[PDB]
């Protein structure tokens, strides 16, 4: 997938970091060590890692992804990445 | 099961009366082993039952339960809220949900989650919120809160719910 | 819409049905307290459903006023009496209405008439809540409308609360929060 | 007394009458929301009328929730019952008192009759020195204000000081 | 009694008078908010005085029921809306009624209708209080009647309370005390 | 503005109209209780419309009693006004604020207009950072339920945190 | 009298400002001698005025007065009751009675009696009862009560009055 | 028509994603499989898709659009794209 | 600061002005109920203005305590009695105070003394609100201070609010304060 | 005057869009079809258009402006152009 | 106990009272026992979705004046797989309140004890009390973990304790 | 004062506390001054239609345990040509409440002081208080003269103090 | 590249000042060029430099000094720009 | 470790500025003069400096970092830097 969205809540220094959805590249999710789950009552599955977002950003750079934008929305900090 | 276990419950309550230093033969205690056994069976009848665009709330639902740690009642109220998609919950079905789970040996946190999960499974709504407030007999009040779906993800939905249950 | 002629023509049929109910419950319809009950219950049921005799366009006659500048307009604690369509038992409570007009406002008594048309019918609380909100939205084309109904259902302390937020009441949380704060 | 068999046999007649009411009000009994209404309304009405199927201290049981039906208009009236008595040799168990209130309230009633029936039932059951019964209820016939009815029997009628103590203690 | 024909015939005269009042206050009767006020105020005044269209004997049709044994009967917190005859400004509040029947009782809704006939007139609180008490006494011939009216007079926090005690409510202080205790 | 002379000159015309109303309602204007009513009603109506004759803190004046007249039906509406503002260089004296509420409320009104007029008058008088006005009133047109109107100007509109502090402090 | 005495009152308030250690020339105190004098004249305007089958009660009449011992306001409510014979008191006349006596330098007991005597003299009723409740600025509340005629002689009349003023 | 605004609410992983307004390019709206609607009480029509925003971003790249900025506002996550 | 000697020396002067007021209102100063009024009114006025006899530095003696970790400190419903300087008529009500210490706290009775020093003077509510807030800020150097005064003016309630430091800058701190003072 | 700030509130799909302040270039404001107004109680005048912000962005590109940044603040969506 | 009784006996003499009068006869021992009961917290040790326990009655003693301060404690926490039994929570409030205290310290000690015992995501503690040595109420508030970091968690807690 | 301070210093040592810690440094003197303030009534003397003064705030100290009891006093009297000034009534409540007391004694002492000062037809005194050494409220009532002899006077008083 | 970053901000509305342009360690020459004043808002633990101008005017002035906007963000009721030379 | 996150709360003109987490480069943390701490109840350690964020940005430029993005979230102002 050319674009990726990652996020963390409450504090930027600590995980979990959300790294994917049902249409994410399964190989990249496995490379990040992500687990799949559906939070109670939600209509979608998500991939997450225990790592803080800075670790995930460093890993995604080694996979050719670059941060295009970072934004805060509610108590969520989101990064939008794109392959080169 | 109730008829078969009633004499065993009554024998245990008779034993309790003697172990407390009381006289089980005194007038006021003669029928107590059977009455206490029947009351305990009624308080736990929930084990005999099985599950089968607007914000919708049902607040101040009276709730009576038994604490599993000490076997002493805990009583209070349940406030429920949900954002339906295609299905809405009939008032009598909601009461049956609260009854099934509350009429068991419980912990307030488990009861709160079981009601929220039962509504989520029955309706498949956008989200559900459940707040239970109760006095544990074993002035102080325990308040437990479960927010699922959009009630957890969208703080504005949860805030509207908490404001409307006042 | 139901007419006064429809009421006169159907009154004996409603009375016959209520007399049949009295007999089917094991009661004596000839005892003093029940003698005129077929007609009293029939007339009461006609009154509880008198909203079928009214139309929203008739309520809207001379109902709209204009303003150069807008403000939040709320009418809270409007007493509401309705009939559950599932069990034919009343559900009673209150309606709180809020709207942010866009140059057109409803007269206060016409807003109350809007609650009356829809509540005086066989209803479900959710439909009643939406019909009031939609009628105001369509009549005034305001920036937004919020309607909260709270009622006790006699067929069931326990209260049902339904809430509809339209336009800016849905889109702008600050507008909705001001409304919910002011209805306390 | 009305039997469970009477209820099963009369349910379709109640449903037919409720269906006839829906048509006579100008409603469509075939619309989804009203399809099961004849049966739901019939069952609710049977439940509301299930009552036809059934020492030197002052003793009071106050704030007993009460649900009844006005016999003049067939609309509910709801509220509370406060009971007081001066026993002689017998005291009334709480569950038996609840059954007394339930038997008479779950009928087509007038609040005055309900008040007297509860007072007479306690007098006959216990043979006490006196009984007082106060019922307070909101009448849906009115709202669509509280009615308070009071019956004092035995020493509750004869001794104003007993009645005053009772009325003070039910606040 | 005032008829529906009397209302239709007198409505233009009431509207002409209210239009004259608008002009005499220095207001512009042609501005949007006042355009239909002559007719709205005339219709509202007719509604506030609709008790002149009713008669106590017509209210008493099917109003009386019998009982073998008596009890104290009270209906408290009956909302009341009336018009001061001295200033033509509303006075609003509550009516508390009590009676000790002597074998005849009024239907609850008929008691409310009695408050309605007399309150929906140009009144003085003292006359209204007595008319309700006298109507019940004459209709039922009970052992006694007590009526308490409490109202805020808009032409004036401050409340006027009037009290009439007839029959055993006057003669037996214990009956009056039970009534006053139960209306709290 | 309406003068004291205008009042004296128009009093008989108001009285004549009130006398005509008494006759048109089916009443007897010659009965003792109604003899002086044309003049008393006329004087009361003139009094109700006498309005036509006329720093780093948040500052609030709440629970200001308000009496007005609905212009649609000519029936009173009564309640309270809560005022808030963030001053720049000028603060409003309590008696001047009361005069503002009185001037606009003592007229034939709609609650929305009254709310805006008070907010605009404070804005123009003080030139503050912002003003908020909330009016809550019972409308006799309805009772024979509370209407709440709210106007936020300047920073009270632009900064939701200022408006929230104001709404919290007026409880 | 008001215009002639206003400068003397203002001179006295100016003197008070200096004797308290304050600066009468500071911006906030410049007009205080005149404003305090005008307020005191308004609080004592009652000296400019003169008196010229049911139980009837007017309760919760707001009352504002000045204590004569310390010159500090006392504020509260007046509840009045009477049993008329041939004359009934108009609401605005009753308000004028309370105003005339309260807008003076007073003691709560005198005020209570003056209102009761004015109603007795105006109406010649069977009896009058007056209860004043006030906070004296100089939480604690002073309650004074005067019962005249049948309100004193018949305890049942007084009891009905006291019950109905709740 | 070089600029585009797209958005999603509450969670970034799931749709609907808003992709247009009344004056949007109808061909691009059809290409995305968008539907037009006016939410109750709103004074405007909008185009939306059921897809989560990441899918829409991938589709828009194939049409020559690049993300210039992404921001949060209330419970809405917005992207500003440019071709 | 005003001294106890100043009070004894000026009490006869206050009594002469209150007697003159009694004569200027048309009252008889020689009637029984008014004989001691010049002195009682003079003593009451001195008591209402006793705040001029104290200084904030005197109140701050032994007033400060230290803590390793902070949290929100609120003292609500502090009864307040003051005199309006424009008309010399009391204004009475309550003061609600909140602060987030930065390692220094005030003893509870010392916080009450701060309200007393400023309220017992000829005042305007706005000045009183700010003086209390500034006194706490200067004494403790906290992260922030919030002061809300609500009063009835005897000459309907006036509510004044001052938010300083983080109580102004961080809306979440101010919101917690406003929620907890209900 | 190389920098420009534009904004919209509540929803991004609909105007009004704020496009200027008292010191804005009057010719550019006229080019956008903007009107001048002072919202009641505000201490400043503003220029606004009925168009949604996407239309304004397209128009500003034809005038040589480019979006440097976009942000949300409260219920306002702001663009900084150069 | 005898040293506390000797001190209370000495106080009764230093006030101008008659320690031999009926009402004061056993007061040195009763006052000593009451003071020991008010400070029994020094004898105890901590080793021996949203969850809230509100309106917990609290009795403590002001360390500055030795006069009681009484009120309520409201506690909230977001657990991480471990929950606190109601009697253990009461023991926590008791351990710290039954000492010579300042309301701020007591508030923090309860919050830290719950954080250490359960290792939750966060804890919030609000104490409200009337101080007899001063009507007015002192309210202190401690927010730890997500109760400090996430304002939405803190707001839900403050709403639910009403 | 130094003897009271020495006794409070001794109490701080007999509890297991550190009298040298910041919060307790000046406590022997602050506690001594608070206790002197609570017992200042021993320094004062009484020589230096229906009328009611209700909701008079009252603060006193239980003589059995030395723990405060706080509440309100409601006073009523029927004068005989002499009336009590409000500040003198407050001084009466103060003189007796600011001592080591039992609520019954304090109630009677206030009633007797008013009877002796005014020689009225009768006096009624009701005290309601919360006792910290115990929520529950203790209510004591003394009726003298016509307040005892005439039940109608007592009933009017009890009705008017609500 | 000496002191390359700058943060400026405005509150409530973007069209009107004050605009915050500095802190205690800001370049005194750049503060004087912008016409800024120094102040410590009551209760704050820091001094700030501010101007009456709306932020767009400040951005235009900072461009003439070699600064470029890298980012703009909203936080609470504050609109912030991060500039770099 | 090419990415860096820094942040400040409440006001941009004053510190503390958060500059690291448990996995941060301890040599860079020492270069910034940062201290390590775990705020009460938190499940993580953080590195912080007393300096306002503008000073930290200037220091990070001298270590080859550039600001890629700045955003507000709650009462926190965050910068995302890259080598
Ligand atoms: N619901 C998220 C905000 C969010 C909105 C849209 C997309 C992603 C996240 C929060 O409250 O933190
Ligand atoms: N109203 C949106 C925020 C928003 C404002 C402006 C434009 C776009 C979206 C929300 O509360 O989520
Ligand atoms: N007051 C704006 C936010 C804003 C702040 C700063 C600059 C511009 C806008 C709102 O609440 O939507
Ligand atoms: N305190 C600012 C937000 C902010 C946080 C961090 C840095 C800068 C500003 C506000 O509420 O508007
Ligand atoms: N909890 C932070 C916001 C935040 C969310 C996500 C990551 C970083 C910070 C605040 O309220 O200030
Ligand atoms: Zn248990
Ligand atoms: Zn139903
Ligand atoms: Zn009926
Ligand atoms: Zn009148
Ligand atoms: Zn009207
Ligand atoms: Zn005095
Ligand atoms: Zn003044
Ligand atoms: Zn202390
Ligand atoms: Zn004791």
Numbering used by the authors:
A (entry chain G): 1 to 84
B (entry chain B), G (entry chain B): 63 to 114, 127 to 212, 222 to 249
C (entry chain A), E (entry chain A): 58 to 213, 222 to 249
D (entry chain E), F (entry chain E): 58 to 111, 126 to 215, 223 to 249
H (entry chain F), N (entry chain H): 1 to 83
I (entry chain D): 58 to 212, 223 to 249
J (entry chain J): 1 to 82
K (entry chain C), L (entry chain C): 68 to 115, 128 to 213, 222 to 249
What do the authors report?
This reaction is the first and rate-limiting step involved in the de novo synthesis of tetrahydrobiopterin (BH4). The effects of GFRP on GCH1 occur via formation of heteromeric protein complexes between GCH1 and GFRP, which are dependent on the intracellular concentrations of the effector molecules phenylalanine or BH4. GCH1−GFRP complexes consist of one GCH1 decamer flanked by two pentameric GFRP complexes.
Complex formation with GFRP-Phe leads to increased activity at lower substrate concentrations and eliminates substrate cooperativity. Upon formation of the stimulatory complex, which implies association of phenylalanine-bound GFRP to GCH1, only minor conformational rearrangements occur. Attachment of GFRP leads to a slight twisting of the last β-strand of GCH1′s β-barrel and the central α-helix in anticlockwise direction. R235A-GCH1 cannot be stimulated by GFRP-Phe, consistent with the fact that, in the stimulatory complex, the side chain of R235 is involved in a hydrogen bonding interaction with the carbonyl oxygen of L40 of GFRP, which apparently is essential for complex formation. Again, conformational changes of the catalytically active GCH1 decamer between active GCH1 and the stimulatory GCH1−GFRP-Phe complex are small. GFRP seems to help stabilize the active conformation in each of the 10 individual active sites of GCH1, thereby reducing the cooperativity between the active sites and allowing for independent binding of substrate.
